[PDB]
Amino acid sequence: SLRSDLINALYDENQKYDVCGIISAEGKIYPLGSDTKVLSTIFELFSRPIINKIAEKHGYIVEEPKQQNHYPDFTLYKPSEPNKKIAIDIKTTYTNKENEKIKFTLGGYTSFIRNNTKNIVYPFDQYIAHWIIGYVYTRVATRKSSLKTYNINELNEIPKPYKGVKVFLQDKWVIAGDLAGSGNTTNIGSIHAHYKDFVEGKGIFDSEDEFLDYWRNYERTSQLRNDKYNNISEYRNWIYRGRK
Amino acid sequence: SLRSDLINALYDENQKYDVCGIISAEGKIYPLGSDTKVLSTIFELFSRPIINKIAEKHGYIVEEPKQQNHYPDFTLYKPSEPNKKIAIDIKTTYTNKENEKIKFTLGGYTSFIRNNTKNIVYPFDQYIAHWIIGYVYTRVATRKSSLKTYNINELNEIPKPYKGVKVFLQDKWVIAGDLAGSGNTTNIGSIHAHYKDFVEGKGIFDSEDEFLDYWRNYERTSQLRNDKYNNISEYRNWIYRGRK
């Protein structure tokens, strides 16, 4: 399937996203420097080509936004069947210590989840799947500035800002959580756990349906949140009480 | 001076470096693609050290947001006068044709500019200057996600995302426009001019104060309409009408 293939695509064998730095035309190697901003972009970069090969393999068409801040990262569809579209959003995170609990941001809960055509590539209803390709890496210190160039012969002498990279493929609704993320609170926070659970799929929600519901009724205001539910628990109650 | 050494160090270093890829510990080199997404992170990488070397040169302390969604990129200050700070943000854009109008985005008008202490590294009232380092690269064909791997002996074969890079250093207010940004839309867009006009500081605001007033009183419109002002003329008019 399109899924399995793509999964094998990022796993085991040969993938090793062991980047060192930026290479110049003269051949000078610039190190990455300490910063998430850089690292996630590189991951997105490694992704593109993988995604475009498993898709084409299965006759799909990959489509990337053009407009700013529009969901999702990659769109995949067969012209003949506009309603069976697929969505893929690349997510990146990092842990301080290797093996700690990771946590992501899954995008907003007040745009295309609430309004079919809001800030998304194609109407929400045309998508059947919403996958998440997550990248996890252990930060290696922060150091500082550079200006130090290296050569091909100093490859192994180059300082990497990260360690043990992991990736996974999962359904958006499966690893999503009940709390809005920090910074925005306009955006869905993921489950908070060990990488393994992502891959295992151990979630909070019962189905993609429960996911959407919780998220559509989530009161955007603190106290108002006290009104309905503040989490999967008070969400269940509210349910039992009459959706009021 | 600071401003001078700075732009001079930008001219010499941000001309020569013609980067073509990302190199790994295996010696593999993945192309870059002309995406503003990857080129801009690259431009910031390059900028870091030169900004530091020059500040240190003049006795300034350099600070970066510990938070990611914060302004500005770099905070410069002289301990001798801790209340006069300088803000430097790095901006990047591309051009499809040499000598053609370009444009940039300059951050949002809704946080610090409006409330002095939101999303900003230090209270807005402490900065005596907000500079903008602008980078313009000359865009080239977007073939395929040719993430084909190349080796060190094939650098000259590696397709570059771009051929050309100009840079300039200017005052924020001086290159600011009266409309919002592309997709972000909640962002201040710059004037829509020619590179030279950037360098020359040929904008539309009469002064820095006219610039804050315009941006502070700007109304959020899902669609223009506005019974206030949508541009410079309208705004100028509005002032003469009592700022109703």
Side-chain angles (χ1 to χ4, degrees):
Chain A
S1 75
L2 184 72
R3 188 169 168 150
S4 68
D5 274 3
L6 185 69
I7 282 222
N8 289 328
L10 346 161
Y11 282 160
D12 42 61
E13 94 294 73
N14 109 91
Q15 73 298 352
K16 308 194 38 161
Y17 319 87
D18 69 328
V19 171
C20 295
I22 285 80
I23 188 117
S24 101
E26 331 64 76
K28 293 175 18 181
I29 311 184
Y30 299 74
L32 290 170
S34 177
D35 54 317
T36 316
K37 174 179 262 205
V38 152
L39 260 219
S40 79
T41 282
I42 283 153
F43 296 128
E44 240 112 312
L45 197 162
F46 285 155
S47 279
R48 213 167 270 108
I50 309 187
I51 290 167
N52 294 65
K53 107 112 29 126
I54 296 324
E56 146 162 276
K57 174 202 205 132
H58 301 62
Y60 296 92
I61 302 194
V62 191
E63 178 176 342
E64 294 173 31
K66 59 152 213 69
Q67 345 83 39
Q68 246 207 57
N69 28 286
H70 278 208
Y71 184 72
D73 285 347
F74 302 75
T75 291
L76 263 62
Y77 68 95
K78 315 171 90 209
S80 56
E81 34 216 63
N83 283 22
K84 295 283 157 271
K85 307 194 173 57
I86 306 179
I88 310 221
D89 241 24
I90 288 104
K91 262 14 169 169
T92 314
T93 192
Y94 69 73
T95 58
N96 284 300
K97 252 186 243 238
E98 151 186 306
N99 278 157
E100 298 168 325
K101 287 205 279 222
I102 69 170
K103 92 176 119 178
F104 300 95
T105 268
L106 313 163
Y109 68 72
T110 68
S111 62
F112 55 93
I113 266 193
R114 309 204 144 154
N115 338 111
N116 186 87
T117 46
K118 240 289 251 227
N119 292 148
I120 165 147
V121 176
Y122 286 100
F124 191 70
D125 49 20
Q126 276 159 56
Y127 294 91
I128 19 157
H130 319 249
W131 297 337
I132 299 277
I133 284 170
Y135 286 100
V136 193
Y137 70 93
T138 320
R139 301 213 21 180
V140 167
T142 286
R143 57 235 36 168
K144 254 139 37 40
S145 178
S146 39
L147 218 34
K148 222 249 136 169
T149 259
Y150 307 66
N151 73 48
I152 194 70
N153 294 120
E154 330 220 60
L155 230 31
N156 291 329
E157 190 185 294
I158 315 181
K160 326 225 177 131
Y162 67 119
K163 197 192 59 192
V165 176
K166 322 257 228 34
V167 63
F168 62 75
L169 212 155
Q170 205 44 291
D171 293 272
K172 173 200 240 169
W173 78 268
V174 174
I175 45 138
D178 68 11
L179 326 174
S182 280
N184 288 250
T185 304
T186 273
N187 70 204
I188 301 175
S190 75
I191 44 192
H192 195 206
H194 182 104
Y195 157 90
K196 199 266 303 293
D197 282 277
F198 273 80
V199 158
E200 233 61 302
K202 278 158 276 124
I204 262 153
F205 285 117
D206 249 298
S207 56
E208 197 171 356
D209 288 287
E210 195 195 36
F211 165 72
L212 288 149
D213 195 52
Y214 180 91
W215 291 106
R216 305 178 161 152
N217 321 318
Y218 199 78
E219 261 309 304
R220 334 137 79 124
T221 300
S222 184
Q223 354 72 8
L224 257 177
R225 239 161 297 186
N226 291 120
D227 270 23
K228 310 190 224 163
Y229 47 81
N230 262 117
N231 66 69
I232 199 66
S233 281
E234 340 198 302
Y235 167 81
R236 313 239 160 103
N237 293 162
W238 179 72
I239 287 285
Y240 311 149
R241 296 172 344 225
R243 285 172 76 72
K244 274 132 321 267
Chain B
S1 46
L2 206 221
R3 191 151 171 175
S4 3
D5 290 330
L6 198 42
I7 175 72
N8 269 182
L10 294 183
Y11 291 134
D12 274 88
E13 339 209 8
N14 282 249
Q15 237 20 247
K16 107 277 266 194
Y17 50 22
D18 221 351
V19 323
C20 35
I22 297 209
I23 208 205
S24 77
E26 228 162 357
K28 262 164 257 142
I29 302 162
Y30 308 77
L32 284 172
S34 35
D35 45 306
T36 332
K37 185 74 200 327
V38 174
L39 288 187
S40 82
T41 297
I42 289 205
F43 291 134
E44 326 163 352
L45 258 229
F46 281 120
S47 335
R48 183 161 307 104
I50 295 170
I51 275 146
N52 285 142
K53 130 112 329 265
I54 309 275
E56 223 158 85
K57 181 183 313 167
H58 297 70
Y60 280 81
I61 292 208
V62 168
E63 263 155 42
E64 299 207 32
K66 281 168 307 153
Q67 206 94 352
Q68 214 65 77
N69 208 272
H70 284 207
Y71 174 86
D73 280 330
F74 302 93
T75 292
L76 267 68
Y77 69 91
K78 202 112 71 71
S80 103
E81 316 187 49
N83 284 318
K84 281 179 225 182
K85 343 179 126 68
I86 307 169
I88 306 167
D89 258 5
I90 303 187
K91 297 296 176 224
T92 294
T93 186
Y94 63 90
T95 199
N96 291 329
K97 217 210 146 194
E98 203 50 80
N99 264 231
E100 180 59 69
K101 301 192 292 52
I102 58 190
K103 84 230 277 207
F104 294 88
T105 282
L106 328 165
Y109 47 95
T110 60
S111 30
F112 55 80
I113 253 184
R114 285 188 194 192
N115 65 47
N116 260 62
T117 76
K118 202 188 150 308
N119 298 158
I120 192 157
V121 169
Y122 283 101
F124 197 76
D125 78 309
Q126 292 162 11
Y127 293 86
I128 64 169
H130 305 249
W131 293 350
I132 293 304
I133 296 181
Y135 282 103
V136 198
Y137 67 84
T138 311
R139 198 176 258 156
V140 150
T142 88
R143 227 355 146 123
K144 71 293 266 103
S145 212
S146 164
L147 257 197
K148 204 219 86 150
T149 42
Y150 294 91
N151 76 45
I152 196 104
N153 294 319
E154 303 171 308
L155 321 175
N156 286 326
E157 274 157 78
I158 300 182
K160 262 150 189 101
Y162 75 84
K163 168 72 131 283
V165 180
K166 293 167 229 97
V167 72
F168 60 79
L169 184 153
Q170 195 38 291
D171 291 87
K172 197 164 183 183
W173 86 266
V174 166
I175 59 168
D178 45 14
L179 334 174
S182 326
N184 22 30
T185 324
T186 187
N187 257 213
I188 295 181
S190 78
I191 55 171
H192 188 224
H194 279 96
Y195 174 69
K196 225 101 278 287
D197 294 317
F198 271 97
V199 165
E200 294 181 13
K202 239 264 233 190
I204 82 206
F205 289 116
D206 277 324
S207 74
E208 198 165 13
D209 274 336
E210 198 184 34
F211 164 77
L212 306 146
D213 197 71
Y214 179 101
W215 287 110
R216 275 128 164 196
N217 316 290
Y218 192 80
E219 230 96 57
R220 195 256 58 177
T221 22
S222 133
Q223 214 256 5
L224 300 142
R225 53 177 130 305
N226 271 292
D227 274 297
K228 250 226 197 157
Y229 70 84
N230 287 278
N231 50 49
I232 206 74
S233 2
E234 302 199 348
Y235 153 96
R236 267 145 190 171
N237 192 245
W238 164 86
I239 78 214
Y240 300 136
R241 298 303 161 248
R243 318 163 57 89
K244 268 144 181 139

